[PDB]
Design a protein around this ligand. Structure first.
Ligand SMILES: C[N+](C)(C)CCO
Length: 422
């Protein structure tokens, strides 16, 4: 058993094109106010580009899990990157006001690329890393996806100003499409040369035993719903992660609703939410490494998310840009930091079930509730304004906060750990 230098190269290249793919998810959402003008469509149409990532994940996750089990790690890496690259190049042919379905086709291809991407941050961690480095590698791969949202918020409004000239607008969006298409192609070329089917030597004793050994997905998902505590977590995780998806997808229509212009700052706020959550996730992760208070920390963070969501809901109105930056970062510290926290707490209640099944069902719950939230809050924003849409998120987070309080600390991994110790 030996570890290899290439393990980091695989992580960064995956994290780079996972960042690239998550760039394309919010690519339209981060500059939603302008893509409305370019294609001449209503708001609900553009969020579907971010929502088609969410709608496609639900039915195709199980077939993609089947593909990974047969064709291995590398083919999913190539297929995810190639579809991300192909979807990026397709968007070049959509640079006209009358070619909106073309970018939908391209975004669907990128959305079909996501199921090959979000499923294997933890999968790469087990294949390439030793036991102590799995949690470090898994975080970096996941934070790469989050960094894509942050970079996908900051960059697109810098490249594309708000201009009503259709032809100059087509010119700037082309540059973003060219860079993202160029970056995806470069990453695809990198994926071809650095990704390998298997390491040279097994990286850990756990991985070596897996290779030496070598239940089903249908059986695992069936037994998981027996655990009431896990069922409660899935509903609450979807209530929180789905709220973040709706908040980030609709962030343009609310920040620019009260602040005309300020597309570049609205991207920074989106970056601030994601970046603060990245800092908040690390703090919570290290805190759990010493305290192991998985239930108490999760409930406090969920409550702090509710207070963070409530405070941002009522501070968005006064019109002070800096206070919106502070509370969005304060909310993101807990709301975005909960996203990796929920996966860690899910393994607590589901050990020894594999992380893939637990993360996948939480991912489905995030997609399902995100779509419900995005559609509903989108209709609430149009019909009743931005604050009721945010309060609508607060109500479900209040329900999520109350529901998490009834979750019992059935930390079966902790029981298993102390059983091995004694
Ligand atoms: C998971 N993302 C936020 C990257 C897209 C929605 O599924």
């Amino acid at each position: 058993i030996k570890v290899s230098r290439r393990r980091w190269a695989v992580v960064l290249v995956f994290s780079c094109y996972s960042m690239c793919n998550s760039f394309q998810w919010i690519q339209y959402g981060s500059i939603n106010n302008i893509f409305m003008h370019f294609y001449g469509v209503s708001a609900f149409a553009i969020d579907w580009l971010s929502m088609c990532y969410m709608l496609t994940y639900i039915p195709l996750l199980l077939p993609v899990a089947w593909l990974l089990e047969k064709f291995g790690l590398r083919t999913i890496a190539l297929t995810g990157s190639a579809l991300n690259c192909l979807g990026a190049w397709v968007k070049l042919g959509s640079l006209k006001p009358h070619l909106f379905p073309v970018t939908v086709v391209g975004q669907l291809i990128c959305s079909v690329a996501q199921v090959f991407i979000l499923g294997m941050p933890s999968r790469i961690a087990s294949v390439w890393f030793g036991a102590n480095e799995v949690s470090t590698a898994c975080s970096v791969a996941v934070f790469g996806n989050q960094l894509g949202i942050a970079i996908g918020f900051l960059v697109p409004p810098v490249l594309v100003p708000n201009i009503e000239d259709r032809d100059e607008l087509a010119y700037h969006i082309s540059i973003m499409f060219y860079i993202i298409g160029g970056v995806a192609t470069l990453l695809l070329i990198l994926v071809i040369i650095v990704f390998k089917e298997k390491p040279k030597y097994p990286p850990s004793r756990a991985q070596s035993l897996s290779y030496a050994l070598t239940a089903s997905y249908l059986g695992s998902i069936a037994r998981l719903f027996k655990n009431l505590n896990f069922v409660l977590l899935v509903i609450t995780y979807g209530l929180n992660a789905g709220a973040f998806y709706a908040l980030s997808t609709l962030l343009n229509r609310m920040v620019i609703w009260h602040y005309p212009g300020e597309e570049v700052n609205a991207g920074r706020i989106g970056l601030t939410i994601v970046i603060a959550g990245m800092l908040g996730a690390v703090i919570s992760g290290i805190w759990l490494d010493r305290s192991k208070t998985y239930k108490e920390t999760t409930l406090v963070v969920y409550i702090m998310t509710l207070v963070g969501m409530v405070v941002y809901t009522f501070t968005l109105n006064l019109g002070h840009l800096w206070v919106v930056f502070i509370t969005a970062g304060t909310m993101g510290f807990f709301m975005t930091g909960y996203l990796p926290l929920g996966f860690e707490f899910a393994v607590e209640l589901t050990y020894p079930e594999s992380e893939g099944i637990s993360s996948g069902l939480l991912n489905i719950s995030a997609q399902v509730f995100g779509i419900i939230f995005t559609i509903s809050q989108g209709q609430i924003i149009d019909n009743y304004g931005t604050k009721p849409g945010n309060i609508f998120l607060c109500v479900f987070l209040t329900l999520g906060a109350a529901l998490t309080a009834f979750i019992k600390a059935d930390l079966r991994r902790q029981k298993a750990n102390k059983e091995t110790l004694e």
